[PDB]
Design a protein around this ligand. Structure first.
Ligand SMILES: *[C@@H]1O[C@H](CO)[C@@H](O[C@@H]2O[C@H](CO)[C@@H](O)[C@H](O)[C@H]2NC(C)=O)[C@H](O)[C@H]1NC(C)=O
Ligand SMILES: *[C@@H]1O[C@H](CO)[C@@H](O[C@@H]2O[C@H](CO)[C@@H](O)[C@H](O)[C@H]2NC(C)=O)[C@H](O)[C@H]1NC(C)=O
Ligand SMILES: *[C@@H]1O[C@H](CO)[C@@H](O[C@@H]2O[C@H](CO)[C@@H](O)[C@H](O)[C@H]2NC(C)=O)[C@H](O)[C@H]1NC(C)=O
Ligand SMILES: *[C@@H]1O[C@H](CO)[C@@H](O)[C@H](O)[C@H]1NC(C)=O
Ligand SMILES: *[C@@H]1O[C@H](CO)[C@@H](O)[C@H](O)[C@H]1NC(C)=O
Ligand SMILES: [Ca+2]
Ligand SMILES: [Zn+2]
Ligand SMILES: [Zn+2]
Length: 710
């Protein structure tokens, strides 16, 4: 097989191509980029088949949360396996890989691919995979093996080939095979070591035995084989360890130590909810200038991580820096580990695919492991269970896609807010000491002109039932006003390539918006008002008046407004120069229950004092330009370049530690730490973007799932 050149070529009885999901634990993307030529079997798969630059794992980058994510398409908060070691307060049980509780189905939520195949008339086999030796939803796969880590790889491969030799009626359609290396070697001596080289060659021989076994059965060009990893590997040192004793004079709490720490009470289940979580994060915040970890309350963690909505995820969390560790006390730390931020290059996992359904000799852009489940369903010709993947985003991997995606259906239509009188019925206790409202009255030609410039990819669609809203048109921007919350859901504007300050003490009522559906300036006097669209970004002094209205007002904390004003005055201009103009879509996010979805009116717990106007938990800023920098965002036919942000709307800037530090040293870093996907913004707002962009839905889904890295 290895000496043979590159290639459904299926034999008798094989009507549909079988699927083999091979996992090599801790096989980082870096190993494939550097040591490929040392691994002849994996290098042939890299040359002949399809492979991604890297595959992004889920946070924490651990074995059990990631392996269960690949087979369910769910974030650990949804499937329940948030760590290899965890505690459930309601069950009052401890989960560990050594305990009998690992076999307890009460911990395993969602629907793994082996169950989905069995429920839809197909047989599924498994030679190791977290959850496959567990009766998930009262059922085990057709053929499974109870975990035994030391069984030689040659035996694992031979048993898998015996399953493929079974008669058509007994023979499974889906297979999973798991291997411990190069993770074990990575933990012992680190990612760049001789032990890792030996472990990589060991997994190459194991994969070689499988491919040679398939070659003998003439299934080498029939089977749709996927070779991936759960996470990556990074180097650790005992000199690179942070101790909690250096921050607390007496530790009375329990800590899940390592690269992704969690802090809870010792007295469980009695004091679990009464435990002062905010006191612990406060006592660990900005303690030292060179602190190698960042304490967070789970709702304050970057939203792209999706690591909060589960009782097993303790409120106190620590974001540990690259190559560092966090322990309770000095007491292992040598070699290497994983569990860190999934954005870190060292945590990136491999992804390779070969078969008749996959594209030959293709290098695909990086993607997330939450997307694998829908792809597995497509290969198996089965309907996927509700997951967090975007069905159709991985269609560019398949020769002939099984599923065809479509744009999300708008559940609410725009109505009202038409220009009637240029005089306001209610002043709304607003004042401008400096007829101008005629600029707000746009004709069909003027409306089409602002739609062409400020809405080049079409208006964001409202994917919310009974959401009373209207579209407000201006010469420099277009906004979608949410009537019930008295503020806009989104504000869209295309800043041109640049080559003035905001008008002070001037604010008036919007003549188009009804007084009962608009904010009053007196509401903020009794947290201050902020402008969603920056009034001074486009046009001149007279152009500013179109933005110095009540409909452009959003509730903002004084400390958050410092980051917001700096971003639109300094950072936004810098980005507009770099990408030859930029289309900006900004708006509020309400997620008080921290489920990663837009809040219902009854879910919002904080409002502006004495009023029904809600306080946003986050603010989104989606920057869209074109890949080809010769064209502007408003006039471009090709692929787009996106940079979305989901910045938490917090009363303090404690997350940045900005004491005695100028805004040019911490604002950009804070925005960069809260970068998300367009899909993350879409889930948190109940909006759908780029529906009028002339491109297939599968291609737009790639842009929506894309995560910009720095
Ligand atoms: C995996 O191990 C479990 C035991 O931990 C096996 O489960 C037993 O299966 C027999 C089947 O005759 C039952 O009588 C027992 O009651 C089961 N015990 C438990 C605790 O569930 C299981 O069969 C093993 N799987 C394989 C494929 O070897
Ligand atoms: C789960 O494991 C923890 C230890 O990690 C156990 O916690 C102890 O709980 C008692 C009260 O039940 C406390 O007095 C101890 O201080 C706790 N120890 C630590 C180190 O936290 C817990 O009991 C275990 N629960 C079960 C059901 O096994
Ligand atoms: C990830 O997908 C899961 C499954 O579709 C989502 O979880 C469901 O959320 C709804 C509404 O909160 C619940 O009624 C269901 O019971 C949940 N199902 C499961 C299996 O937990 C989850 O919200 C999605 N996450 C994101 C961020 O979109
Ligand atoms: C659990 O199994 C039942 C059938 O016994 C099925 O209807 C249900 O959808 C399954 N649930 C999940 C989450 O897979
Ligand atoms: C960018 O667009 C110009 C035309 O405006 C074209 O000549 C050029 O080839 C394009 N670049 C790429 C990389 O496609
Ligand atoms: Ca929510
Ligand atoms: Zn692992
Ligand atoms: Zn490991």
């Amino acid at each position: 097989w290895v000496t043979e050149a590159c290639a459904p070529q299926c034999p008798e009885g094989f009507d549909q191509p079988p699927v083999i999901l091979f996992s090599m634990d801790g096989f980082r993307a870096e190993y494939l980029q550097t040591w490929s030529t040392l691994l002849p079997n994996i290098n042939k798969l890299k040359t002949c088949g399809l492979h991604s630059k890297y595959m992004r794992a889920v946070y924490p980058t651990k074995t059990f949360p990631n392996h269960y994510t690949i087979v369910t398409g769910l974030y650990p908060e949804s499937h329940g396996i948030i760590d290899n070691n965890m505690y459930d307060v309601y069950l009052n049980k401890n989960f560990s890989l050594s305990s009998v509780e690992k076999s307890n189905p009460a911990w395993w939520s969602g629907q793994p691919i082996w169950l989905t195949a069995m429920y839809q008339g197909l047989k599924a086999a498994s030679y190791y995979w977290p959850g496959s030796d567990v009766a998930v939803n009262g059922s085990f796969p057709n053929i499974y093996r109870n975990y035994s880590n030391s069984v030689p790889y040659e035996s694992r491969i031979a048993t898998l080939l015996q399953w493929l030799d079974l008669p058509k009626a007994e023979r499974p359609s889906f297979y999973t095979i798991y291997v411990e290396e190069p993770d074990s070697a990575g933990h012992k001596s680190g990612p760049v070591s001789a032990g890792v080289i030996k472990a990589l060659q060991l997994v190459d021989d194991a994969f070689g035995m499988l491919m040679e076994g398939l070659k003998q059965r003439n299934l080498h060009n029939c089977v749709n084989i996927i070779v991936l990893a759960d996470h990556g590997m990074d180097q650790t040192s005992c000199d690179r360890v942070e101790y909690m004793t250096d921050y607390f004079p007496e530790i009375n709490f329990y800590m899940y130590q390592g690269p992704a720490p969690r802090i809870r009470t010792r007295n469980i289940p009695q004091d679990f909810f009464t435990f002062n979580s905010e006191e612990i994060v406060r006592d660990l915040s900005c303690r030292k200038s060179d602190q190698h970890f960042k304490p967070y309350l789970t709702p304050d963690l970057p939203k792209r991580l999706h690591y909060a909505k589960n009782v097993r995820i303790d409120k106190v969390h620590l974001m540990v820096d690259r190559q560092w560790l966090a322990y309770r006390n000095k007491g292992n730390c040598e070699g290497g580990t994983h569990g860190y931020n999934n954005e870190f290059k060292s945590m990136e996992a491999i992804f390779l695919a070969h078969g008749p359904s996959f594209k030959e000799k293709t290098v695909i852009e990086p993607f997330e492991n939450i997307e694998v489940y829908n792809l597995l369903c497509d290969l198996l010709h089965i309907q996927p269970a509700p997951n967090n993947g975007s069905h159709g985003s991985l269609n560019h991997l398949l020769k002939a896609p099984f599923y065809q995606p479509s744009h999300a259906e708008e559940l609410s239509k725009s109505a009202g807010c038409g220009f009637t009188t240029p005089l306001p019925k209610d002043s709304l206790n607003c004042s401008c000491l400096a007829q101008v409202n005629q600029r707000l009255n746009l004709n069909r030609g003027e409306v089409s002109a602002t739609e062409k410039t400020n809405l080049p990819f079409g208006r964001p669609r409202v994917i919310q039932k009974n959401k009373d809203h209207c579209l407000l048109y201006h010469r420099e921007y277009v906004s979608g006003f949410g009537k019930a919350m008295k503020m806009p859901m989104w504000s869209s504007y295309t800043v041109p390539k640049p080559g003035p300050p905001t008008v002070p003490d001037c604010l008036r009522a919007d003549v188009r918006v009804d007084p009962s559906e608009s904010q009053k300036c007196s509401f903020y006097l009794a947290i201050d008002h902020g402008f969603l669209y920056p009034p001074a970004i486009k046009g001149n002094n007279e152009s500013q008046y179109d933005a110095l209205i009540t409909s452009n007002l959003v509730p903002m904390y004084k400390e958050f407004k410092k980051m917001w004003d700096y971003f639109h005055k300094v950072l936004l201009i810098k980005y507009a120069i770099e990408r030859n103009g930029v289309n900006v879509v900004s708006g509020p996010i309400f997620d008080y229950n921290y489920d990663g979805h837009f809040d219902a009116p009854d879910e919002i717990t904080n409002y502006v004092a004495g009023t029904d106007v809600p306080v946003p938990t986050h603010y989104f800023v989606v920057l869209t330009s074109c890949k080809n920098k010769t064209h502007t965002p408003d006039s471009c036919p090709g692929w787009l370049d996106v940079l979305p942000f989901v910045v938490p709307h917090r009363p303090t800037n404690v997350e940045s530690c900005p004491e005695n530090k100028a805004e040019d040293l911490w604002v950009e870093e804070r925005f960069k730490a809260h970068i998300a996907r367009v899909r993350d913004v879409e889930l948190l707002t109940g909006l759908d973007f780029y529906q009028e962009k002339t491109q297939p839905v599968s291609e737009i889904l790639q842009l929506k799932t894309y995560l910009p890295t720095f």
